Design a protein around this ligand. Structure first.
Ligand SMILES: *[C@@H]1O[C@H](CO)[C@@H](O[C@@H]2O[C@H](CO)[C@@H](O[C@@H]3O[C@H](CO[C@@H]4O[C@H](CO)[C@@H](O)[C@H](O[C@@H]5O[C@H](CO)[C@@H](O)[C@H](O)[C@@H]5O)[C@@H]4O)[C@@H](O)[C@H](O[C@@H]4O[C@H](CO)[C@@H](O)[C@H](O)[C@@H]4O[C@@H]4O[C@H](CO)[C@@H](O)[C@H](O)[C@@H]4O)[C@@H]3O)[C@H](O)[C@H]2NC(C)=O)[C@H](O)[C@H]1NC(C)=O
Ligand SMILES: *[C@@H]1O[C@H](CO)[C@@H](O[C@@H]2O[C@H](CO)[C@@H](O[C@@H]3O[C@H](CO[C@@H]4O[C@H](CO[C@@H]5O[C@H](CO)[C@@H](O)[C@H](O)[C@@H]5O)[C@@H](O)[C@H](O[C@@H]5O[C@H](CO)[C@@H](O)[C@H](O)[C@@H]5O)[C@@H]4O)[C@@H](O)[C@H](O[C@@H]4O[C@H](CO)[C@@H](O)[C@H](O)[C@@H]4O)[C@@H]3O)[C@H](O)[C@H]2NC(C)=O)[C@H](O)[C@H]1NC(C)=O
Ligand SMILES: *[C@@H]1O[C@H](CO)[C@@H](O[C@@H]2O[C@H](CO)[C@@H](O[C@@H]3O[C@H](CO)[C@@H](O)[C@H](O)[C@@H]3O)[C@H](O)[C@H]2NC(C)=O)[C@H](O)[C@H]1NC(C)=O
Ligand SMILES: *[C@@H]1O[C@H](CO)[C@@H](O[C@@H]2O[C@H](CO)[C@@H](O[C@@H]3O[C@H](CO)[C@@H](O)[C@H](O)[C@@H]3O)[C@H](O)[C@H]2NC(C)=O)[C@H](O)[C@H]1NC(C)=O
Ligand SMILES: *[C@@H]1O[C@H](CO)[C@@H](O[C@@H]2O[C@H](CO)[C@@H](O[C@@H]3O[C@H](CO)[C@@H](O)[C@H](O)[C@@H]3O)[C@H](O)[C@H]2NC(C)=O)[C@H](O)[C@H]1NC(C)=O
Ligand SMILES: *[C@@H]1O[C@H](CO)[C@@H](O[C@@H]2O[C@H](CO)[C@@H](O)[C@H](O)[C@H]2NC(C)=O)[C@H](O)[C@H]1NC(C)=O
Ligand SMILES: *[C@@H]1O[C@H](CO)[C@@H](O)[C@H](O)[C@H]1NC(C)=O
Ligand SMILES: *[C@@H]1O[C@H](CO)[C@@H](O)[C@H](O)[C@H]1NC(C)=O
Lengths: 99, 194, 674, 95, 49, 99, 489
């Protein structure tokens, strides 16, 4: 047994990002052209934020996506109300903790 | 709590003295009176004994009965009482402690688990408990009740057997007879204890 | 002979006569290579420089196997640099005090150089390394000792040799702490050696000091670092590198009366050095009086027979004699054999033991019920144990006393003859060797050897290894393995003394394979890594031990104590059963629980709760085929007189100055000039 | 969370529990599963709704398990309603 | 050195689809590449169900 | 003599490897704690990837490799031997910023 | 060969030493031979037989017989019952009068409180360091076995053993028969009496928990000797020439003894098997008895009855022998041998290693079913006050194949209630699962699971013992002792 082992990501010094697809309100559960396009745009913006965090002035908080989801997280519950009852957009729920 | 750890013995024999059933399992029935059940510790000697009971009620050990549903868990404690007079353990539960509703609806059966201690579960025994005043099928009279020697002459005419379940609670099946066309009648028997 | 498959192999030379077969046990091991070191001593700095390399005993040169090399061979050099590339470095670790010493880089030739202080207090050392293997082979740790070099005497021309009486067995005596420094007395010459008799130098006497007949009647010898002592015809003579002065009444000995002398046998150097008091280094006896020899070789009489006759409540006018005195494992205690006649007029004499304690200066009479004839002479030795356990012999038999003088009797063969002359073609016992592990070897002048284990009554007659007519002795090498030394004159002066090792463990395993005995426990571990523990008022000692044994043979760890009880124990035990093996793990703690606050006679109570005591750990039942070394240690309470207090920033002689003088007046509690 | 303890040789790379969801359209299920030193298997399941709307059954089956075991298939039921014990109360403070 | 972990979204293929709901069906995810690299390892595994 | 764990260092003048042992006989267990420390030489101050020195350490049970195969579902694995690469320099992902 | 290898101990006879005894010798008043062992001072022991030997060592060296110095008129010097009080004092009952003997000095003291002839002194000894049970070891009873209760006098003392004062007869007014003992049952904090109304006998209790109560009656052919197990768990052994009984409760249920042969158990009646028991030794958890036709029985005594097996044959019986438990798993047969050449007695010992002797293929006992049982609740004692609770813990590793059922029991369930949880966490390197069980304890009234007939008052203090044991432990689990401790409310 090889026990008492250091963590893989911390030892190999790798940064890791998470990006899950936006939910759909379609009854069957399928996506289409536009939902996949939204997924592509959000992943692009996440990588652009990663590559633009080379600013030499320190932000109060880490995780550069904090600059993304700061002025919009004050009303997340309202957004869910618009999606659960199906009164919003293309029936797409863009989560904030998923990217 | 391990599912296939191994249970091969039934250590407990409990009866409510209202309806007698097979001694191989513990089946209990709930009425408008209190559920009053007498249970004893089954061993190599199957009769009740004043020695093992006094051996158990000197270390502060009394049985516990767990009633469970698909959505409910409840525990009921036997009282600790001197072994000077008794032979068996005894507990009576008011009906309102289990169900407060007394309407007619589709109510599930209960699973009963008897043990010597709850967390330190050592001598487990399983069984069932059935509500009688809330079961829909048991309120009606199916037909004319055939006596004995009126179903014994029915035997050479039977050709097949059918059963039912009443999905929510089993052990209340109906057994129906399919018969040769030389005989005539709808023949259905009813069970209450599986 | 070569072979790769493990197990036991039966080898036998088929010849005309009947030759016994031997079973050799060969097992796979991942430990193959060895350390080799060479020292040089520099006295200006008071230090030693050691040079270390790695050598393989199969592909080594001839010099590196007999410890006479100075420069590594081709195989040793290549192996050393190959193991240096893989990241292996040796370090020297002192045992009595746990200090380590690290080497430098590898020089041009394969050699690690380590510098070292000269200690004379912690002389036991190990040399170790990392867990780096070369090609699935390790290096084994090496245990050794070193102190100041000891000089052997030189020989002036025109001197005369000192010999044992003709036809008598040659004798040998070696130093108690550092072996490989010994003197051997033969029938033609006396030799002294600074090594294990690889190079030797004769010991002779100036002309005119002794007669020719006196020169051929040397009864015993003893060897110290300062000089040698001879017992010539009942007179003690001292040979030093300067003179051959004869001891007389001016130094506290009688003339023409001395029967023998003895020294210490177990290297208790640490407690002897830390004692801060010079004690006796020798004890002599002259059949009516015991003398206790201190350093510089002058001594006062210890005890006469009249005082002992008064001690033993004897009815007076009795024939009470002494025959042997030995230094047991307690560093400040002695034992003496007392022969008692009991109204005589017979050949039968009682043998008792009287123990003399120097810390209390008292005498104690022990339990012995031994009857022996007049003709028998006795020699006894003390084994490596806290309790007094003796092995004694009278040139035909061997008697034993084990477990605090309770198991007393005669050591016998498995057949039960109990007479070792009848199994040895009527030859007398010549030599008896004890060791730290516990194994005793008995050797006769026929050159046949028996084997005993301590706390084991039965003896084992070993297979014949050496001729009948050979003039041999048994000794120890740099380690504690047995070596046989052959002496023969009429040779080229370079082969008159040849040493060959004796594989005692392999012969014992062959005998056991024939017999079928077994060791009842799998393992017995402890954490006693030392021998001398010293602790003050506010400290305690924690000792850990463990036995692993088969499924339910009920065993335990016996703790035995000797000396003055000034402490308490608490033992905690854990019991585990797994895979058909039981494990018993025990932790014991030694502590004191007295309060000195607000009491009278603080110093008297402080003295009443100080002193030393001896502890030993052993398994419950054990037999042969058990190679366990039984741990014996000592605890002393009291101050070492080497620990004190200092205010910061102050020192004795960093600041140089001169003499001062001053007058102080009118402020004391009239005119003080200081 | 469930634990699986093996009585014999186990499937080290392959997880020993196969789970199916009856209606993947109303329920969002996320599972984690790891192994232990003695090949014990620890898995946990998080179950939530999708939007405002039924019932479903989740089945955990021990595929390598034998047919003589007492308990092989576990079948929890998830209902997207409110319980009969979910109500709101107002304490008046006068007691 | 950078990792990104994603979950693939199901999608229906546009074709005839004689049946009502389901037909040929696939899983899709974007392919992200960053500036400074030419080599990407893509490890696919199941979600446990 | 029977079950030994051996180490091997490449360039042993910049890495210190030590091994501590523990043995339990009834449980049939041997615990080996292997500690690798840096020896504070063999690099110079640089910029993330400009001063990386690549070493390694090999860790093997004596007599193990080639003879021990861990058999699982879908194959078997060679055991008893490992090579660990070690990059001594300054790790990527460290910045200085204005608080 | 098997069992024991004899070994003699003798000292002090190295020379012509003139030592002679002085006074009238002391001898026992029963055919059997007994070895009474002091509880914590375990080295001190008294061998009662045809001659009485009081040893400070573990019967090492040679011992002169105990003797009466004739300065006081003891008459016939027969010992009927001996007891060990706390200190350096031992109590003997010679010729109907109590006497105290100090063995560190050579002081005899005449007990002056007792007036009518008594024949037995009873009491319990706690041996935890402190000042709580030093007081508990000072309540002593003195009574005459075989007397008629309406008429006879029962004595008691609370100042150790200094003065004995008479105990009033109003309590025992309604009790009829012959008494067979009055005991300070500190297990249930009661005073029990043993009544013999007819050929059967029973126990009657005094204090308010089960006052005016009874136990289940048992047969009482002839007289009986009662032995308390020394850890205040209530375990009792009652034995005589032709019977043996074990009480797992504090006397409430008194039952018979089982016997194991070819993995079938049978009840053991001494008279019907035609044997006579000669010596009985009793440890904290074990029992052993030597039968006069050269036989040795070893048994484990616990809840759910006791199991007694017959150890392999060895000629141990020599008209003077007596077994005593030297240690857990170590039995010892001791025989004093006389010597008139030096006028002293030396000793012959066998050390029986019962764990190894319980391993023969002829017996074929299935091995231990629990691998490890460990706790830190055995070192000291505990106290509970009002409105407070305490927690205890224990670790158990079971065997690879079996499935043992643990059980926690309480000596005094009237004044001590518990709730125990056993949960599994981690597992060992082999694969066996560690189990940790934690018990929470507090007062029985505060739990609320007992009738008013059972709780029995809350304003008074009491003592109890908590025991963690295995219900279905086999034989040969000698070294895995069950855990037990003392808890004072
Ligand atoms: C497995 O087995 C268990 C066994 O217990 C079973 O649990 C039981 O499920 C029942 C569901 O059928 C539960 O009945 C519900 O009870 C509610 C009131 O609970 C009250 O709880 C109080 C505190 O515990 C208690 O004091 C009180 O006592 C009773 O009060 C009655 C007055 O309400 C009185 O008449 C009784 O004599 C007694 O004194 C109660 O126990 C009810 O609100 C609930 O629904 C009502 O039903 C009645 C009749 O059908 C109806 O007239 C009334 O309007 C309610 O209908 C709806 O109520 C909701 C609010 O809940 C409103 O929002 C709606 O608009 C409707 O008006 C129901 O009867 C029972 O409590 C429960 N037992 C326990 C111990 O928890 C499981 O269901 C079983 N599982 C399966 C799968 O079978
Ligand atoms: C009862 O048993 C006793 C125990 O053996 C018997 O004692 C024996 O007595 C013999 C004579 O009485 C002795 O024999 C003499 O030995 C001299 C030793 O010479 C050197 O020997 C070593 C090693 O000796 C042997 O080597 C082989 C080699 O494999 C071994 O296997 C074997 O076991 C044995 O040990 C040689 O290595 C030497 O060669 C060189 O040595 C140098 C070191 O100085 C080294 O640097 C170099 O490289 C060489 O290796 C020697 O050969 C012999 O020399 C004697 O022979 C004579 O020698 C002189 C001088 O050279 C010649 O002029 C002359 O012609 C003749 O050749 C002689 O053989 C025997 O040693 C001794 N046993 C022991 C263990 O010492 C006893 O006799 C027995 N009793 C009865 C009644 O049988
Ligand atoms: C105690 O005094 C002795 C006196 O000899 C000291 O030995 C000497 O130590 C010096 C210092 O290393 C040696 O000088 C140099 O050593 C290096 C080692 O790498 C070597 O490469 C050089 O060529 C040079 O020799 C010197 O050789 C050595 N003396 C001898 C005779 O070898 C010793 O160091 C002193 N110990 C202490 C603790 O002060
Ligand atoms: C190993 O054996 C020796 C030899 O018997 C033991 O020494 C003995 O120790 C006891 C106790 O200290 C001595 O008893 C003494 O008795 C007198 C009265 O007779 C009393 O006044 C003393 O205070 C003391 O108790 C005994 O004399 C002594 N024997 C000898 C010959 O001196 C020793 O104790 C044994 N070791 C162990 C660990 O058992
Ligand atoms: C590799 O690095 C280059 C250089 O930073 C990245 O290309 C740059 O991408 C940005 C945004 O994607 C471009 O800015 C935009 O340019 C358009 C066209 O003028 C303008 O309309 C927008 O308002 C914005 O300014 C920038 O021009 C472009 N640089 C070049 C030289 O084309 C590229 O994204 C990096 N690669 C990856 C995979 O990220
Ligand atoms: C102690 O008190 C309890 C009270 O519950 C007694 O229980 C009796 O139980 C029987 C059968 O269940 C009832 O018929 C009685 O009416 C109960 N007694 C009372 C007073 O209600 C129990 O028997 C009592 N025990 C003793 C030894 O007196
Ligand atoms: C039934 O409930 C009542 C009310 O809490 C309780 O007093 C009673 O003890 C319960 N019955 C049982 C058997 O526990
Ligand atoms: C004795 O027991 C009776 C019932 O048997 C009870 O009424 C009485 O109160 C008890 N007295 C004492 C002092 O315990």
């Amino acid at each position: 047994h090889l026990i008492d082992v250091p963590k893989k990501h911390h030892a190999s010094r790798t940064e890791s990002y998470v990006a899950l697809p936006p939910l759909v309100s379609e009854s069957l559960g399928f996506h289409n052209n536009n939902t996949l396009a939204v997924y592509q745009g959000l992943v692009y913006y996440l990588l652009w934020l990663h590559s633009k965090y080379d600013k030499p002035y320190a932000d109060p908080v880490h995780d550069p996506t904090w600059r993304w989801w700061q002025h919009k997280t004050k009303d997340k519950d309202y957004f869910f109300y618009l999606f659960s009852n199906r009164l919003a957009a293309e029936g797409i729920y863009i989560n904030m903790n998923a990217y | 709590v391990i599912h296939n750890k191994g249970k091969e013995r039934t250590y407990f024999s409990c009866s409510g003295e209202g309806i007698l059933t097979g001694l191989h399992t513990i089946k209990l029935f709930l009425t408008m009176d209190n559920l009053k059940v007498r249970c004893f510790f089954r061993n190599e000697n199957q009769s009740p004994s004043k020695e093992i009971l006094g051996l158990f009620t000197s270390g502060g050990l009394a049985p516990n009965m767990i009633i469970t549903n698909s959505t409910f868990y409840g525990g009921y404690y036997f009282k600790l009482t001197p072994f000077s007079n008794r032979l068996e353990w005894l507990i009576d539960i008011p009906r309102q402690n289990i169900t407060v509703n007394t309407d007619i609806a589709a109510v599930e059966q209960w699973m009963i688990k008897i043990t010597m201690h709850e967390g330190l579960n050592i001598y487990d025994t399983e069984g069932t408990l059935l509500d009688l005043v809330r079961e829909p099928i048991l309120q009606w009279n199916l037909g004319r009740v055939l006596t004995e020697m009126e179903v014994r002459d029915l035997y050479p005419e039977v050709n097949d057997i059918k059963v039912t379940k009443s999905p929510c609670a089993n052990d209340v099946a109906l057994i129906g007879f399919m018969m040769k066309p030389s005989s005539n009648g709808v023949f259905i028997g009813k069970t209450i204890s599986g | 002979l070569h072979c790769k498959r493990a197990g036991i192999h039966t080898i036998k030379p088929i010849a005309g006569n009947q030759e016994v077969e031997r079973h050799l046990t060969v097992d796979n091991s991942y430990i193959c290579y060895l350390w080799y070191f060479t020292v040089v001593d520099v006295y200006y700095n008071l230090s030693q420089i050691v040079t270390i390399w790695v050598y393989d005993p199969e592909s080594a040169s001839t010099e590196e196997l007999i410890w006479t090399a100075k420069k590594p061979s081709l195989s040793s050099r290549v192996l050393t640099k190959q193991m240096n590339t893989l990241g292996q470095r040796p370090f020297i670790f002192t045992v009595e005090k746990r200090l380590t010493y690290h080497p430098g880089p590898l020089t041009s030739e394969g050699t690690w150089v380590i510098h070292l202080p000269m200690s004379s207090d912690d002389i036991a050392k190990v040399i170790r390394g990392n867990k780096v293997a070369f090609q699935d082979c390790f290096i084994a740790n090496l245990y050794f000792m070193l102190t100041y070099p000891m000089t052997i005497i030189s020989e002036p021309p025109g001197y005369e040799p000192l010999t044992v009486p003709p036809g008598s067995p040659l004798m040998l005596s070696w130093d108690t702490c550092i072996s490989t420094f010994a003197l051997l007395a033969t029938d033609q010459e006396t030799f002294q050696t600074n090594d294990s008799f690889q190079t030797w130098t004769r010991v002779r006497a100036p002309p005119g000091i002794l007669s020719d007949a006196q020169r051929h009647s040397l009864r015993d010898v003893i060897i110290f670092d300062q000089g040698t002592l001879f017992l010539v015809d009942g007179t003690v003579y001292l040979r030093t590198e300067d003179e051959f002065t004869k001891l007389d009444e001016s130094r506290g000995i009688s003339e023409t009366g001395i029967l023998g002398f003895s020294k210490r046998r177990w290297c208790q150097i640490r407690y002897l050095y830390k004692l801060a008091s010079k004690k006796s280094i020798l004890i002599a006896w002259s059949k009516t009086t015991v003398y206790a020899g201190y350093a510089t070789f002058r001594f006062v009489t210890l005890t006469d027979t009249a005082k002992l006759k008064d001690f033993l409540k004897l009815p007076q006018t009795d024939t009470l004699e002494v025959m042997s005195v030995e230094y047991l494992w307690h560093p400040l205690e002695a034992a003496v054999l007392l022969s008692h006649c009991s109204v005589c007029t017979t050949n039968t004499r009682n043998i008792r033991i009287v123990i003399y304690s120097a810390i209390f200066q008292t005498w104690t009479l022990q339990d012995f019920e031994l009857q022996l004839p007049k003709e028998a002479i006795l020699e006894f030795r003390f084994l490596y144990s806290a309790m007094p356990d003796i092995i004694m012999w009278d040139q035909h038999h061997v008697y034993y006393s084990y477990k605090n003088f309770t198991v007393v009797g005669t050591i016998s063969t498995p057949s039960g003859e109990t007479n070792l002359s009848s199994l040895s073609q009527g030859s007398k016992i010549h030599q008896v060797l004890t060791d730290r592990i516990g194994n005793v070897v008995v050797k006769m002048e026929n050159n046949v050897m028996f084997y005993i284990k301590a706390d084991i009554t039965e003896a084992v007659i070993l297979h014949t290894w050496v001729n009948t007519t050979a003039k041999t002795v048994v000794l120890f090498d740099k380690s504690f393995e047995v070596c046989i030394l052959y002496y023969n004159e009429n040779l080229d002066e370079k082969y008159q003394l040849q040493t060959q090792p004796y594989p005692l463990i392999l012969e014992l395993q062959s005998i056991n394979k024939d017999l079928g005995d077994w060791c009842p426990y799998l393992a017995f571990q402890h954490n006693i890594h030392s021998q001398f523990y010293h602790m003050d008022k506010g400290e305690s000692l924690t000792i850990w031990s463990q036995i692993v044994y088969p499924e339910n043979r009920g065993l335990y760890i016996v703790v035995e104590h000797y000396g003055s009880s000034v402490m308490t124990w608490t033992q905690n035990l854990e019991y585990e059963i797994a895979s058909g093996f039981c494990t018993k793990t025990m932790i014991t703690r030694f502590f004191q629980t007295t309060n000195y606050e607000l009491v009278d006679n603080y110093y008297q109570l402080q003295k009443e709760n100080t002193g030393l005591m001896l502890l030993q750990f052993r398994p419950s039942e054990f037999s042969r085929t058990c190679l366990t070394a039984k741990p014996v240690f000592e605890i002393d309470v009291g101050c070492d007189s080497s620990k004190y207090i200092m205010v910061r920033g102050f020192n004795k002689s960093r600041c140089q100055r001169r003499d001062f003088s001053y007058v102080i007046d009118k402020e004391l509690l009239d005119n003080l000039k200081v | 969370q469930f634990k699986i303890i093996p009585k014999a040789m186990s499937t080290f790379p392959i997880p020993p529990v196969s789970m199916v969801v009856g209606n993947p359209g109303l329920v969002e299920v996320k599972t984690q599963g790891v192994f232990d030193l003695n090949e014990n298997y620890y898995l946990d399941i998080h179950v939530s709704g999708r939007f405002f709307q039924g019932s479903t059954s989740i089945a955990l089956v021990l595929w390598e398990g034998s047919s003589k075991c007492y308990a092989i298939t576990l079948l929890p039921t998830i209902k997207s309603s409110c319980s009969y014990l979910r109500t709101m109360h107002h304490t008046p403070g006068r007691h | 050195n950078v990792q990104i972990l994603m979950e693939a979204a199901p999608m229906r293929s546009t074709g005839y689809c004689p049946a009502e709901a389901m037909c040929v069906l696939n899983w899709y995810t974007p392919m992200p590449f960053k500036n400074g690299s030419v080599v990407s390892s893509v490890d696919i595994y199941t979600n446990g169900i | 003599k029977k079950l030994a764990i051996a180490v091997t260092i490449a360039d042993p003048e910049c890495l210190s490897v030590t091994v501590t042992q523990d043995v339990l006989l009834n449980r049939n267990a041997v615990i080996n704690k292997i500690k690798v420390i840096d020896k504070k030489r063999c690099s110079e101050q640089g910029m993330i990837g400009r001063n990386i020195k690549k070493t390694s350490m090999m860790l093997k049970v004596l007599g193990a490799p080639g003879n021990c195969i861990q058999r699982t579902y879908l194959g078997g694995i060679i055991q008893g031997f490992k090579v660990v690469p070690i990059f001594i320099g300054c790790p990527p992902g460290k910045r200085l910023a204005f608080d | 060969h098997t069992l024991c290898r004899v070994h003699t101990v003798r000292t002090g006879k190295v020379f012509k030493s003139n030592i002679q005894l002085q006074g009238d010798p002391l001898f026992y008043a029963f055919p059997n031979t007994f070895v009474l062992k002091n509880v914590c001072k375990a080295d001190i022991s008294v061998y009662l037989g045809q001659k009485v030997f009081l040893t400070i060592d573990n019967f090492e060296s040679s011992l002169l017989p105990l003797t009466v110095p004739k300065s006081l008129a003891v008459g016939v010097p027969s010992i009927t019952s001996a007891h060990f009080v706390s200190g350096s004092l031992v109590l003997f009952v010679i010729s109907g009068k109590g006497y105290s003997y100090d063995y560190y000095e050579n002081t005899w003291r005449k007990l002056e409180g007792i007036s009518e002839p008594v024949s037995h002194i009873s009491g319990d000894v706690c041996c935890f360091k402190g000042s709580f049970c030093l007081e508990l070891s000072n309540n002593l009873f003195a009574y005459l076995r075989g007397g008629q209760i309406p008429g006879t006098n029962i004595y008691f003392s609370d100042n150790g053993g200094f003065s004995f004062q008479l105990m009033n007869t109003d309590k025992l007014s309604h009790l009829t028969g012959t008494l067979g003992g009055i005991f300070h049952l500190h297990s249930m904090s009661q005073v029990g009496v043993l009544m013999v109304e007819n050929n059967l006998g029973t126990f009657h209790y005094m204090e308010y928990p089960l006052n005016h109560s009874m136990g289940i009656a048992f047969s009482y052919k002839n007289l009986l000797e009662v032995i308390m197990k020394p850890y205040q768990r209530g375990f009792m052994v009652l034995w005589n020439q032709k019977s043996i009984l074990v009480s797992s409760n504090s006397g409430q249920i008194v039952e018979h003894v089982r016997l194991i042969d070819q993995k079938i158990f049978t009840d053991l009646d001494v008279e019907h098997a035609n044997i006579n028991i000669y010596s009985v030794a009793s440890n904290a958890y074990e029992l052993a008895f030597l039968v006069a036709e050269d036989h040795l029985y070893y048994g484990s005594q616990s809840y759910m009855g006791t199991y007694v097996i017959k150890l392999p044959h060895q000629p141990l019986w020599s008209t003077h022998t007596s077994i005593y438990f030297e240690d857990i798993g170590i039995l010892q047969v001791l025989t004093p041998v006389a010597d008139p050449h030096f006028a002293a007695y030396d000793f012959d010992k066998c050390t029986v290693n019962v764990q190894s002797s319980l391993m023969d293929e002829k017996l074929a006992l299935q091995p231990c079913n629990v691998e490890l049982l460990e706790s830190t609740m055995i070192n000291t004692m505990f106290t509970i006050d009002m409105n407070s609770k305490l927690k205890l813990s224990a670790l158990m590793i079971p065997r690879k194949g079996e499935n043992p059922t643990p059980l926690v029991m309480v000596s005094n369930p009237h004044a001590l209630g518990f709730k125990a949880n056993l949960n599994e966490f981690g597992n060992t390197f082999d694969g066996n699962s560690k189990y940790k069980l934690d018990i929470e304890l507090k007062q029985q009234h505060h739990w609320g699971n007992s009738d008013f007939n059972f709780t029995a008052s809350i304003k008074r203090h009491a003592i109890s013992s908590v025991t963690v044991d295995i219900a279905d432990k086999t034989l040969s689990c000698v070294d895995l002792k069950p855990l037990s401790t003392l808890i004072s409310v």
